[PDB]
Design a protein around this ligand. Structure first.
Ligand code: MET
Ligand code: CL
Length: 243
């Protein structure tokens, strides 16, 4: 069954986008089988064990960290979409209202830390030290901390919606895939949104030996086609941004 392509994906939008393109791939002779995963670890582990042939869930900075940490022999088969990341809160309508010494919750995924840092910088609430390596920025790079905010980075990315829902902290950084699955719209519900999300394009990742796989190329080409990208835009109202 070399006509069958097994793809690991996040629930929303990723798995939904995959289900929507299935008929387009079938007209091309490719049988797409989706495995939906609820976390950011098992899709990579599954790709390495051969349980799946590709995955669709992670951005390049995540991917790079994961390849280096795990010695995964993977390749990027191509960028599909962007998820501009939000800070969410049930307490404050704006970051400018947060009392000093309040906690900002972020996940333990280090590759998202520079995103929260750009939002706070744009909001005028922190500055970064001269000679920060902005590609790998962390909380230790903060020079001015205007509202003297604390950052908790212990939680798994998959529980960030619970922290929000339970009113923990002044605000919470939630990846859009989890936000959208719980019924939050980043464009309407977030109190601040990432201004430039292009470094965080979500990719199709595969094993190195499948780097020239014809079924994979067909998947990437269908996911980047104009009809599909317009569909993605209309489905989530611009919260999910096609490349
Ligand atoms: C596993 S890296 C985070 C991926 C998530 N869909 C985002 O773009 O923020
Ligand atoms: Cl690309």
């Amino acid at each position: 069954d070399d006509s069958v392509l097994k793809v690991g994906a996040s629930p929303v939008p990723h798995a939904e986008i995959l289900e929507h393109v299935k008929p387009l791939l079938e007209k091309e002779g490719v049988k797409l089988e989706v495995t939906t995963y609820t976390d950011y670890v098992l899709p990579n582990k599954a790709l390495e064990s051969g349980d799946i042939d590709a995955n669709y869930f992670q951005h390049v900075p995540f991917f790079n960290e994961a390849v280096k940490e795990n010695d995964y022999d993977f390749v990027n088969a191509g960028a599909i979409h962007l998820e501009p990341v939000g800070l969410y809160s049930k307490k404050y309508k704006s970051l400018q209202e947060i009392p000093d010494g309040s906690t900002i919750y972020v996940s333990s995924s280090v590759s998202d830390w520079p995103r929260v840092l750009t939002i706070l910088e744009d909001a005028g609430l922190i500055t970064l030290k001269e000679g920060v390596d902005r590609t790998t920025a962390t909380f230790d790079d903060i020079d001015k901390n205007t509202k003297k905010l604390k950052f908790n980075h212990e939680s798994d990315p998959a529980i960030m919606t619970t922290l929000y829902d339970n009113e923990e902290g002044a605000a919470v950084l939630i990846n859009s895939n989890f936000a959208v699955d719980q019924g939050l719209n980043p464009k309407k519900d977030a109190i601040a949104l990432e201004k430039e999300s292009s470094p965080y394009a979500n990719i199709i990742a595969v094993r190195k030996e499948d780097e020239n796989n014809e079924n994979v190329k067909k998947l990437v080409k269908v996911l980047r086609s104009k009809e599909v990208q317009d569909w993605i835009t209309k489905k989530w109202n611009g919260a999910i941004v096609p490349v």
